[PDB]
Design a protein around this nucleic acid. Structure first.
Ligand SMILES: [Mg+2]
Ligand SMILES: [Mg+2]
Ligand SMILES: [Mg+2]
Ligand SMILES: [Mg+2]
Ligand SMILES: [Mg+2]
Ligand SMILES: [Mg+2]
Ligand SMILES: [Mg+2]
Ligand SMILES: [Mg+2]
Ligand SMILES: [Mg+2]
Ligand SMILES: [Mg+2]
Ligand SMILES: [Mg+2]
Ligand SMILES: [Mg+2]
Ligand SMILES: [Mg+2]
Ligand SMILES: [Mg+2]
Ligand SMILES: [Mg+2]
Ligand SMILES: [Mg+2]
Ligand SMILES: [Mg+2]
Ligand SMILES: [Mg+2]
Ligand SMILES: [Zn+2]
Lengths: 232, 60, 43, 104, 129, 155, 86
RNA sequence: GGUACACGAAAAACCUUACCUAGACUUGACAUCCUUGGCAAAAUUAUGGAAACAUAAUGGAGGUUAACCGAGUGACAGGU
RNA sequence: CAAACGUGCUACAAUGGCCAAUACAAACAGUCGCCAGCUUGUAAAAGUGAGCAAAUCUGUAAAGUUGGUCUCAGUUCGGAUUGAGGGCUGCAAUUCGUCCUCAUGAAGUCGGAAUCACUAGUAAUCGCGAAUCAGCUAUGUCGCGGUGAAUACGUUCUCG
RNA sequence: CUGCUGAUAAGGUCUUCAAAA
């Protein structure tokens, strides 16, 4: 049957919030809730070739701070910091010139075990007419070789352009979805194929969190150094 | 007809009671949360994505 | 033997006076100020 | 010596609890490192808001889930602070989730 | 040498003060005659149940403070408070009180209403045709 | 298909006459969860019994319930057409419960004035083996005696 | 129902038209959509064409119809006879 | 059918509104790409008006065009 | 709108109707708001006008207890429908808002074949709050507390 | 421990593929 969202079930217990701010009134709460959505959607739908794993937003009465974790931040940086100013102006237009922007790019360590970029690669391969069995097999084998626990990939839709929708699942390793202690990262993406839309959902297991607390700690960004700038 | 209705909602009317609250992300008119300015079906998505700070699932 | 008339005519006089006395006093609000979230007063 | 601020009533509130405890710990540590008599970091009842949302897109109003948002609240009143404590308080950098309602 | 007891029931606290006296117990609830505080619907015997079978000839002066609940909940709270204060005087009553189980919190509280249900456990009418 | 026997809650002794049956019949005449109202009804009826019979109300009540209290129960068991009944001996607890239930049901139907007097007169009438609960007990007893043959087969 | 201090209500475009057509001798039907306007004493003697929703039904006001709403003397839906289902 | 019927709809007098009648509009109420200037859009007061919209007014925050205000312009926007 | 079904509210009543005095909650919400007190009014409410950005101020607890009256009747039950006078919101209340007062007083006296929910603070019952909301016969939805039961011998039968 | 217990319009998806990594 239907299952609750893996991220939503674990939020507020073993996962911190992607946007951390306290608005003044109900009128401002909607504007701030929509502007952050616009910024995140921008960073995800465009500038996709940089493998942006996640973007967090942190706002005060008047100051906006953006933390963009990316696997290949060279594409965000551009040639001698060219596209950086373009995305800065895009964000400033999105929120407002009256505020102070503190954009900060962060190179994410051990990218392979991140469901967002795994799903994005899956969707890109699907859209590029790559055969599905080979695509999922190579993604699963590279994810496992990255040194993580089980990964479950569900790819549904008009499969290979067929007129009857199917679904194909590959679980390889233990994926306890009912357990709350487990560190399960879940992402979902849409491959826009010439025959319609394909939905790819990737669950990845990254061990068990044996330290009680609302995170306040990096999650698989720490194995190598996670120090990139563009801030003040 | 949805784009015209969204634009008309943003535009101020000539009477005060003419004004209604639509969702800001989507354009749904009914079942809009004035605390968040977002309809129920987009509030669920934002809460499951972690966008709204402090909105955790309730156990009572 | 009034046959309605007088009372409703007085009501109509009040209504016509209101219509002729309409003033564009359009507004939207009530209490003002005291809208902030405070801080360390300089951080 | 001067005071210039009698009965500084700091009020803290946040959607998160543990961050609030940590911020209160840092505040009390600094204010005891300076010569100020803290009344005490007491807690106040937490205002909990519950929103009920139908899961389904179209029908089945019976199947509906719930969400909560808690505004944890703490109180802390300082008797006499003086510049010697105010200047040190200027450099606290309270995290964004915490909210101050200083009342002087 | 006074004794203090704290009972609770159905979200209704009680603070019972037992004072040694030999001029009739003169039970008193929240500075008011119990016959006037309670509906006097013989619920008085409910709170006297642990103070009847053992003794009240010891003429304990009773100082009761109750804030919350209805009246049956308040009576249960002061019963538990009287028992718990009695545990501070000649603990030999502890065995006899435990025997008939007047020294355990009742633990019964009102359940929370559930969505899709007309109450804690009631369900809507079901039609098949 | 349950294979579990239900627990039993305490009956509680009555705090006036120290007779559990008084509390049981209070709970039986309970309606809308009004313990005070039920207790008032019972105690007013007992005072009217004092005023009329000039005897002990608890003794009169016991004499009424013991006389109304049945012996046999007929359990419906359908096989092919209609139902053939089965006489079975009842436990004492269910015996008392049925007696009290019949007493209350036939008390809340009599033609008289306030339910106080209604139930009081019903009790005094059942104390002398002449009443409506008496007729009910007689009917079930006669039906069981008629269908004594099928007592051997129960299920 | 309607408050006292507020009084009655007319759109005042109907009122201006009524005043003009009353000062003019050769009156003709006044085509109005304002069903919310109440029939003022000065309205008496004129004939109005109220928008029932589809067409303009003609109503001749009298010294008696004074007080009610202008569209109250015209309908909006019509039902006259059912048909047997079976 | 169970698994629809105080369900979508956690609010239909106007709006909502997607329906009917009628009065009006056409790269359009909204958006991008291009050749091109910004020395506006609002809001409100008059007359015609059922109101849309028209003819005249204060010609407006600003920042030299940033956003937006335009002309030309065909790809097109738009569709509950 | 000739009709039919589903889900609910109100009743057919002395375990009650009306009147007076009066005790005991939890949770939640609030600066175009919550509105204390006072004056006016038979009342909805109006005016004045503090307090509260809230464990501080506001949102009357009702069933329950006592007393008075009705005395088993289509009634001091029941409130539908209907006429009139007013209040509030709103440009605007006729189609199509709700509230108050006055007046009228349908059916209905426990509901056929047949069915529903429930295993303790549960059913039953009494109030309070919030969401969407200028306003709303939401009697709906989501929550909170007060009083508070009866029964389970057993799987022969019935549905899954 | 043997009551009674009858019927259900027509045509239809759904495996593309291992060549291989
Ligand atoms: Mg659309
Ligand atoms: Mg509205
Ligand atoms: Mg209900
Ligand atoms: Mg049925
Ligand atoms: Mg409409
Ligand atoms: Mg200029
Ligand atoms: Mg220029
Ligand atoms: Mg009475
Ligand atoms: Mg106080
Ligand atoms: Mg008052
Ligand atoms: Mg009474
Ligand atoms: Mg009749
Ligand atoms: Mg009546
Ligand atoms: Mg009306
Ligand atoms: Mg009768
Ligand atoms: Mg069970
Ligand atoms: Mg047969
Ligand atoms: Mg045949
Ligand atoms: Zn939405």
């Amino acid at each position: 049957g239907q299952k609750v969202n893996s991220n939503g079930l674990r939020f507020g217990i073993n996962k911190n919030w992607i946007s951390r701010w306290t608005a003044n009134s109900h009128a401002q709460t909607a504007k701030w809730l929509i502007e952050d959505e616009k910024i995140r959607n921008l960073f995800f739908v465009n500038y996709r070739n940089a493998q942006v794993s996640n973007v967090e937003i942190e706002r005060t009465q008047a100051t906006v701070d953006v933390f963009v974790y990316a696997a290949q931040p060279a594409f965000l940086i551009g040639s001698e910091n060219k596209n950086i100013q373009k995305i800065t102006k895009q964000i400033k237009q999105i929120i407002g010139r009256t505020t102070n922007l503190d954009l900060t790019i962060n190179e994410i360590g051990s990218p392979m075990l991140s469901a967002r970029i795994i799903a994005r690669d899956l969707a890109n391969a699907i859209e590029a007419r790559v055969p599905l069995r080979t695509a999922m097999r190579q993604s699963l084998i590279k994810v496992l070789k990255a040194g993580a626990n089980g990964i479950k990939v569900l790819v549904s839709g008009r499969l290979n352009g067929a007129e009857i929708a199917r679904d194909k699942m590959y679980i390889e390793g233990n994926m306890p979805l009912s357990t709350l202690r487990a560190d399960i990262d879940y992402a979902l993406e849409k491959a826009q194929t010439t025959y319609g839309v394909i939905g790819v959902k990737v669950w990845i297991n990254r061990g068990m969190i044996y330290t009680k607390g609302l995170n306040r700690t990096p999650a698989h960004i720490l194995h190598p150094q996670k120090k990139q700038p563009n801030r003040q | 007809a949805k784009k015209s209705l969204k634009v008309k909602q943003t535009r101020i009317p000539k009477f005060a009671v003419r004004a209604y609250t639509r969702c800001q992300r989507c354009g749904r008119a009914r079942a809009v949360l004035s605390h968040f300015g977002v309809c129920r079906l987009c509030f669920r998505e934002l809460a499951y994505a972690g966008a709204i700070p402090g909105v955790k699932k309730a156990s009572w | 033997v009034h046959g309605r008339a007088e009372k409703l005519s007085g009501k109509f006089n009040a209504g016509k006076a209101f219509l002729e006395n309409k003033t564009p006093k359009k507004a939207k609000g009530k209490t003002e100020e005291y809208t902030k979230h405070r801080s360390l007063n300089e951080l | 010596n001067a005071v210039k601020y009698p009965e500084l009533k700091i009020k803290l509130e946040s959607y998160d609890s543990t961050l609030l405890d940590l911020t209160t710990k840092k505040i009390v540590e600094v204010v005891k490192g300076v010569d100020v008599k803290i009344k005490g970091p007491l807690p106040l009842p937490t205002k909990k808001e519950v929103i009920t949302i139908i899961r389904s897109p179209h029908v089945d109003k019976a199947s509906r889930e719930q969400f909560e948002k808690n505004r944890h609240k703490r109180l802390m009143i300082l008797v006499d602070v003086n510049q010697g404590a105010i200047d040190s308080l200027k450099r606290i950098k309270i995290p964004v989730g915490v909210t101050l309602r200083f009342s002087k | 040498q006074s004794y203090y007891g704290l009972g609770r029931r159905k979200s209704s606290s009680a603070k019972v003060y037992l004072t040694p006296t030999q001029d009739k117990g003169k039970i008193t609830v929240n500075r008011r005659d119990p016959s006037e505080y309670f509906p006097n619907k013989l619920v008085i015997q409910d709170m006297e149940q642990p103070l009847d079978l053992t003794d009240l000839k010891k003429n304990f002066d009773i100082n009761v403070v109750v804030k919350g609940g209805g009246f049956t909940g308040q009576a249960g709270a002061i019963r538990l408070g009287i028992v718990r204060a009695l545990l501070q005087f000649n603990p030999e009553l502890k065995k006899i009180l435990k025997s008939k189980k007047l020294t355990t919190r009742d633990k019964r509280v009102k359940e929370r209403k559930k969505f899709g249900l007309y109450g804690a456990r009631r369900a809507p009418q079901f039609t098949k045709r | 298909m349950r294979k579990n026997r239900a627990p039993k809650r305490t009956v509680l002794p009555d705090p006036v006459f120290n007779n559990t049956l008084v509390t049981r019949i209070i709970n039986v005449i309970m309606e809308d969860g009004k313990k005070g109202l039920a207790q008032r009804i019972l105690y007013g009826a007992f005072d009217l019994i004092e005023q009329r019979t000039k005897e002990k109300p608890l003794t009169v009540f016991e004499r009424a319930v013991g006389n109304v209290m049945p012996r046999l129960e007929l359990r419906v068991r359908r096989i092919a057409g209609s139902n053939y009944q089965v006489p079975t001996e009842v436990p004492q607890d269910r015996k008392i419960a049925l007696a009290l239930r019949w007493i209350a049901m036939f008390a809340r139907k009599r033609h008289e004035k306030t339910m106080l007097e209604k139930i009081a007169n019903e009790i005094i009438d059942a104390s002398n083996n002449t009443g409506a609960a008496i007729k009910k007990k007689d009917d079930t007893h006669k039906m069981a005696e008629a269908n004594k043959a099928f007592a051997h087969m129960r299920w | 129902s309607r408050s006292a201090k507020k009084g009655a209500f007319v759109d005042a475009h109907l009122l201006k038209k009524v005043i003009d057509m009353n000062k003019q001798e050769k009156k003709r039907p006044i085509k109005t959509w304002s069903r919310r306007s109440t029939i003022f004493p000065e309205f008496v003697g004129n004939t109005f064409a109220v928008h029932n929703g589809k067409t303009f039904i003609n109503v001749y006001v009298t010294d008696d119809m004074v007080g009610h709403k202008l569209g109250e003397f015209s309908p909006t839906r019509n039902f006259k006879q059912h048909t047997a289902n079976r």
